[PDB]
Design a binder for this molecule. Structure first.
Ligand SMILES: CC[C@H](C)[C@H](N)C(=O)NS(=O)(=O)NC[C@H]1O[C@@H](n2cnc3c(N)ncnc32)[C@H](O)[C@@H]1O
Ligand SMILES: CC[C@H](C)[C@H](N)C(=O)NS(=O)(=O)NC[C@H]1O[C@@H](n2cnc3c(N)ncnc32)[C@H](O)[C@@H]1O
Ligand SMILES: [Cl-]
Ligand SMILES: [Cl-]
Ligand SMILES: [Cl-]
Ligand SMILES: [Cl-]
Ligand SMILES: [Li+]
Ligand code: NA
Ligand code: NA
Ligand code: NA
Ligand SMILES: [Zn+2]
Length: 921
C-alpha cells in the first residue's frame, strides 16, 4: 500500500511447495500425448547411435526399489546421450519364461501344475505374464522413464522364440551343443536340473560323519585289520558309494591304532584325533598314497566292493585323506569314476526319494534317510564319530529349498571348446567398476559345461529330434523349420504336435528306416532365453544394432545376463555383444540390511511415488554410489527431499526476479558485464563442463553434490542474496540489474538443460517458464556446450578470495546478530581495517563494495585499534550505526533522505528511480 511500491517476485507461476505426487502424473500425460520418445528419436535419426540394451526383468510381480534403480540409471544415460550428439534408442524388455513365473502362480494363486494339462498351465503362465508386464510398464512410467513402451520385446513373442532357436542352432552347428549323463545340480522341490545362476547359497546344518571301510584285499600293503576312515557331510550319498579316493604322490598316509588300526593321511593325525576323540594313538608305518592304488575295500552296510582310486581332487583341508567316492552324486567323483570305469549309481529319484538302488532305505527322502543310514552304520560298527556343522549350501533360487547333485542325462553347452574366446572378449570389454572384468574372467576360467536342459513346461523347448536309432537329430534344415514354425505359431506348437509334424515336409534320416521319429520334452534355461536377446533384439530390430555400447544391470548378473549373453554371442559371433558394462549394487535399508518384509524394511516404490514423488527418487539415485551397495530409508529420502526443497527454492527465485527481463535483445555483452557477474559466468561454465564429464564417466554422485553446492551456498547464499535487494530497486533498464539477470538467464537456460537427464518433471516445469521457448520440452535441445571466458583464471583467483572475505564479513554481521543490537545487515555501516593483502584486493574491486556486502556504507582506514570488536585473520572490522534517515523504499540508512522535495522520505537513489521513467510507465 503506502509502505510498499511493488518490486517483488512476479513469476510465482512455479509454486514454492512441491506437490509433485499430484502434479507429475499430469506432466506425464502431456509427454505421452506428444510422443516425446519418437520426437527425440526422429530428431537424432542421423546422429551416431549409442545403444543401451535393456536387460529383461522378470514378470514375477510388481517392481521393487532395485527395479527402479536399474531403470533410472538407464534413463540417465539414455537422456544424456540423446541430447549430446548421439541417437539413444531405448526399448524395454521382460524375461517371461522360467520358474520365476511358474513358482509365482503355484504359490500365490494356489494352482497345481499337475492338476492341469501342460498346455493349460502354459496358458495360465502366459496370462499372468501379460498382466505383470502391463503393471510393471505403468509403474516404470510413473517413475519417469522414457522408452519405446508401446513396442517392447517379451520372451514369449514368436519372433524372439524363432531367433532363440537360431541361436541354439548356430552353436549346435559349431559343435558347442552335446548331451551326456553327468552329475549336475538337482532341485527335488522343482524336480528339475539347475545351474549356478539358478542357485542361492544359505547356511544349512549337516551331520558330519567319520566312518570306517573294511579292507578285503590289501594287495600286499594292508591287512584285514586296517580300516579306512571317511569324512562325509552327506550321509545320503553313502548308498551310492563305488570307491575311495586318496592322493597318490603329494600325500602319504599312515596307520594309527586306538584299539584298532585305521588308515588316514599323515598330516591329519592330530585333526582326526580331536574329532573322533581318540585317547591314545600310535603310528605303525607310512605308505605313499600311490602305493594304495587298486586296493579293494568293503561297503560298511552292503559289504560290496569299493575300489581305492587315485585323484588330484582329494585335499589335506578335508577331514581325512580318504574321500567317499559316489560317481552319481559328485563332479570330481564322476571324473575319477569314469577314469577307473566305476559304476554310476544314483539311488535318488527326481523327487529326492531313495529308489530300489538303495535296498534298506527305499522310498525315503534323502535328508530324512540320513539318520537311518547312521543307525545302520552304527549297527555294523563302522561309524566312528557323529557331529553337526553349519555351512553354506546350494538352494533352489525359487523354492529356497536345498539342491543335490544327481548324475542324469542333460543337454550342455560346451564352454570348454571356446573358453579362450570368452576370455578374450572379457579382456576387450570396458568394465565399470573395474573389478567386474576379473569377476567374469574368473567365472569363465573355472566354469564347467553349462547345463541348459530344464524339466519344466513354461519355456522354449529344445529343438532336438530322435530317430529309431535314438540318435539326436540337429541340423540347419530342422533348426530353420522349427524356427519359422515358432515364428508363426509360437513355442506352443511344439507341445501340441508329434515329431513328424514338426519336421521338414520330406525329411528322412538314416537312423530310422521306417520314418518314425520322436521329439525332446525338456525346455531351455531361462537364462538362455535372456542370453539370446542380442540376436533377437539388437540384431533383428532395425532400431538397434549389435554389439550394444553398454549393459547396465545388477551385480548378480555376472553369473546371469552378463555371462549368458557373452556365452551365446561369442559362441556364434566370437565377439562380445556389448562394448561396455556398468554394474550397480543392491538396495538395502538404512542399517545395511536386505529389504525383506520379514524385517519390515521394504521401501515400496509406489509408497514413495505418492508420498514424495518421482524426482526425489531420481535425486536419490544420483545421490548414492550405485556401483556399490546402496542403502535407502524413509529418513534418507526425506533428506533428499529437503535437498530438492533447496533446489526448488533456488529455481523459483531464479524464475521470480527474472520475470521483468526479455533476453531477445536486452542482452548485456560479456565485456559490459560486471566482473562479479563475469566470475559467475566462469563458474557456470565450469559447472557445465564438470556435469557433462561426470555423465560421460557415469559419476552421478558428483553431479548431485556439485549442483547442491552450486545452489545452497554459491548462488542462494552469496550471489542471489546480494541480488535480493539490488535487482528490483534499481531501474529496470539499468545495466547493473540487466547484466546480473543475463547471468541468471544463462544459468536458468543451462541448468534446466543440464538437469534434464536426472530430473525431468521439474526440468520441463521450469522449461515452461522460459522467455525463449524454441523447443516444446527441455529434452528436445542439446546439453549446453562449455564456452571459454577471457581472463577467467585471474578473475577466479580474485573473486574466490572475494567470496572468502565476504563470508568473513557475513560472520562479523552474524556476530552483530548475536548481539542483535542493530539486528540488521543493510542498515549497518562498516569501518574496515584490512591487511595489505586485503587492502590490495579491495583496491582491485571496481564495483561497489557496499552493495556487494549489502551494507549501507563502508569506510577503509588503517586505524589499527582492535578495541574489543573483532579481527579476522585478514581484516579488523567495526560494525557501526549510520544514524542517518532510513529510506522507506530501499531501507538503506542514508543522509541523502530529505534532499528531494517531492520525496522527502526517500534517498537520492530511490527518488531518482521513482521520478524518472525510461520510455514508459
Ligand atoms: C528334516 C528335519 C529337519 C531338517 C530338522 N530341523 C533337523 O533334522 N534338524 S537337525 O538339527 O537334526 N539337522 C541335522 C542335519 O543332519 C541330519 N541328521 C540329523 N540327525 C542325524 C543323525 N542322527 N544321523 C545322521 N544325520 C542326521 C538332518 O537330516 C539334518 O540335515
Ligand atoms: C537382466 C535381468 C535378468 C535377465 C533377470 N530377468 C533378472 O534378474 N530379473 S529381476 O527382475 O530379478 N532383476 C532385474 C534387475 O534388477 C536387479 N535387482 C534385483 N534385485 C535388486 C535389488 N534388491 N537391488 C538392486 N537391484 C536389484 C538385478 O540385478 C537386475 O539388474
Ligand atoms: Cl510345483
Ligand atoms: Cl563330503
Ligand atoms: Cl499332431
Ligand atoms: Cl512325439
Ligand atoms: Li529436515
Ligand atoms: Na486346480
Ligand atoms: Na528326453
Ligand atoms: Na518332461
Ligand atoms: Zn532508497
Amino acid at each position: 500500500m503506502e509502505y510498499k511500491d511493488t518490486l517483488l517476485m512476479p513469476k510465482t507461476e512455479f509454486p514454492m511447495r512441491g506437490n509433485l505426487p499430484n502434479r507429475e502424473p499430469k506432466m506425464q500425460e502431456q509427454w505421452a500425448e506428444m510422443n516425446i520418445y519418437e520426437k527425440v528419436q526422429k530428431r537424432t535419426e542421423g546422429r551416431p547411435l549409442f545403444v543401451l540394451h535393456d536387460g529383461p526383468p522378470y514378470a514375477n510381480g510388481d517392481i521393487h526399489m532395485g527395479h527402479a534403480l536399474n531403470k533410472i540409471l538407464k534413463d540417465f544415460i539414455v537422456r544424456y546421450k540423446s541430447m549430446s550428439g548421439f541417437c539413444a534408442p531405448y526399448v524395454p524388455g521382460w524375461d517371461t519364461h522360467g520358474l520365476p513365473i511358474e513358482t509365482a502362480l503355484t504359490k500365490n494363486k494356489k494352482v497345481n501344475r499337475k492338476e492341469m494339462t501342460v498346455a493349460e498351465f502354459r496358458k495360465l503362465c502366459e496370462q499372468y505374464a501379460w498382466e505383470q508386464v502391463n503393471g510393471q510398464r505403468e509403474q516404470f512410467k510413473r517413475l519417469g522413464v522414457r522408452g519405446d513402451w508401446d513396442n517392447p520385446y517379451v520372451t514369449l513373442q514368436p519372433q524372439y522364440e524363432a531367433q532363440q532357436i537360431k541361436v541354439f542352432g548356430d552353436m549346435a552347428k559349431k559343435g558347442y551343443i552335446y548331451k551326456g549323463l553327468k552329475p549336475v545340480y538337482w532341485s527335488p522341490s522343482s524336480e528339475s536340473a539347475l545351474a549356478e545362476a539358478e542357485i542361492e547359497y544359505y547356511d544349512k546344518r549337516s551331520a558330519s560323519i567319520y566312518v570306517a571301510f573294511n579292507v578285503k584285499d590289501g594287495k600286499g600293503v594292508l591287512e584285514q585289520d586296517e580300516k579306512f576312515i571317511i569324512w562325509t557331510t552327506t550321509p545320503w550319498t553313502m548308498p551310492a558309494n563305488q570307491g575311495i579316493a586318496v592322493n597318490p604322490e603329494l600325500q602319504y598316509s599312515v596307520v594309527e591304532a586306538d584299539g584298532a588300526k585305521y588308515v588316514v593321511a599323515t598330516e591329519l593325525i592330530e585333526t582326526v584325533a580331536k574329532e573322533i576323540e581318540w585317547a591314545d594313538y600310535k603310528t605303525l608305518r607310512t605308505v605313499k598314497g600311490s602305493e594304495l592304488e587298486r586296493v579293494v575295500a568293503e561297503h560298511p552296510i552292503y559289504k560290496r566292493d569299493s575300489l581305492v582310486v587315485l585323484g588330484d581332487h582329494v585335499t589335506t583341508d578335508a577331514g581325512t585323506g580318504c574321500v567317499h567316492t559316489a560317481p552319481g552324486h559328485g563332479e570330481d567323483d564322476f571324473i575319477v569314476g569314469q577314469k577307473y570305469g566305476l559304476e554310476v549309481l544314483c539311488p535318488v529319484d527326481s523327487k529326492g526319494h531313495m529308489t530300489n538302488e538303495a535296498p534298506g532305505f527305499e522310498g525315503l527322502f534323502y535328508d530324512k534317510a540320513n539318520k537311518p543310514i547312521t543307525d545302520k552304520l552304527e549297527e555294523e560298527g563302522a561309524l566312528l564319530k557323529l557331529s553337526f556343522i553349519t555351512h553354506s549350501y546350494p538352494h533352489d533360487w525359487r523354492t529356497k529349498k536345498p539342491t543335490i547333485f544327481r548324475a542324469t542325462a542333460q543337454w550342455f553347452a560346451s564352454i570348454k571348446d571356446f573358453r579362450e574366446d570368452l576370455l578374450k572378449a572379457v579382456e576387450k570389454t570396458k568394465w565399470v567398476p573395474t573389478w567386474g572384468e576379473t569377476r567374469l574372467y574368473n567365472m569363465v576360467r573355472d566354469r564347467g559345461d553349462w547345463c541348459i536342459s530344464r524339466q519344466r513346461a513354461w519355456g522354449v523347448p529344445i529343438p532336438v529330434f530322435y530317430a529309431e536309432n535314438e540318435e539326436p537329430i540337429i541340423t540347419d534344415e530342422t533348426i530353420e523349420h522349427v524356427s519359422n514354425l515358432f515364428r508363426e505359431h509360437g513355442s506352443n506348437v511344439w507341445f501340441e504336435r508329434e515329431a513328424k509334424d514338426l519336421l521338414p515336409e520330406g525329411f528322412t534320416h538314416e537312423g530310422s528306416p521306417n520314418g518314425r521319429f520322436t521329439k525332446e520334452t525338456d525346455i531351455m534355461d531361462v537364462w538362455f532365453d535372456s542370453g539370446s536377446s542380442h540376436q533377437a533384439v539388437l540384431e533383428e530390430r532395425e532400431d538397434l544394432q549389435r554389439p550394444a555400447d553398454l549393459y547396465l544391470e545388477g551385480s548378480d548378473q555376472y553369473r546371469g545376463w552378463f555371462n549368458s549373453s557373452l556365452s551365446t554371442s561369442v559362441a556364434v559371433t566370437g565377439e562380445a555383444p556389448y562394448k561396455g558394462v556398468l554394474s550397480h549394487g543392491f538396495a538395502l535399508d538404512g542399517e545395511g540390511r536386505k529389504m525383506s518384509k520379514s524385517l519390515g524394511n521394504v521401501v515400496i516404490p509406489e509408497k514413495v511415488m505418492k508420498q514424495l514423488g518421482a524426482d526425489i527418487l531420481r535425486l536419490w539415485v544420483a545421490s548414492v554410489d550405485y556401483q556399490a551397495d546402496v542403502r535407502v530409508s524413509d529418513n534418507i529420502l526425506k533428506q533428499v527431499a529437503e535437498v530438492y526443497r533447496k533446489i526448488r527454492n533456488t529455481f523459483r527465485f531464479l524464475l521470480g526476479n527474472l520475470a521483468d527481463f526479455n533476453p531477445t535483445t536486452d542482452a548485456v555483452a560479456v565485456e559490459d558485464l560486471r566482473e562479479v557477474d563475469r566470475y559467475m559466468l566462469v563458474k557456470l561454465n565450469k559447472l557445465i563442463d564438470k556435469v557433462k564429464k561426470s555423465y560421460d564417466s557415469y559419476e552421478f554422485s558428483s553431479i548431485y553434490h556439485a549442483v547442491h553446492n552450486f545452489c545452497t551456498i554459491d548462488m542462494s547464499s552469496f550471489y542471489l542474496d546480494f541480488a535480493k535487494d539490488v535487482l528490483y530497486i534499481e531501474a529496470e533498464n539499468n545495466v547493473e540489474r540487466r547484466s546480473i539477470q543475463t547471468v541468471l538467464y544463462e544459468t536458468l537456460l543451462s541448468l534446466t538443460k543440464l538437469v534434464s537427464p536426472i530430473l525431468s518433471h521439474t526440468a520441463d516445469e521450469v522449461w515452461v517458464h522460459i522467455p525463449n521457448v524454441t523447443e516444446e520440452s527441455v529434452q528436445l535441445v542439446d546439453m549446453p556446450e562449455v564456452q571459454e571466458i577471457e581472463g577467467a583464471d585471474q578473475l577466479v583467483e580474485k573473486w574466490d578470495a572475494f567470496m572468502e572475505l565476504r563470508d568473513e564479513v557475513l560472520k562479523a554481521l552474524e556476530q552483530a546478530r548475536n548481539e542483535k543490537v542493530i539486528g540488521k545487515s543493510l542498515e549497518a555501516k562498516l569501518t574496515l581495517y584490512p591487511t595489505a593483502d586485503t587492502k590490495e584486493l579491495l583496491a582491485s574491486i571496481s564495483e561497489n563494495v557496499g552493495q556487494l556486502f549489502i551494507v549501507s556504507d563502508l569506510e577503509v582506514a588503517e586505524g589499527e585499534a582492535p578495541a574489543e570488536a573483532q579481527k579476522f585473520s585478514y581484516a579488523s572490522i567495526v560494525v557501526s550505526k549510520a544514524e542517518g534517515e532510513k529510506c522507506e523504499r530501499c531501507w538503506v540508512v542514508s543522509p541523502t533522505v530529505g534532499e528531494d522535495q517531492d520525496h522527502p522520505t526517500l534517498c537520492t537513489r530511490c527518488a531518482d528511480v521513482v521520478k524518472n521513467h525510461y520510455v514508459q510507465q
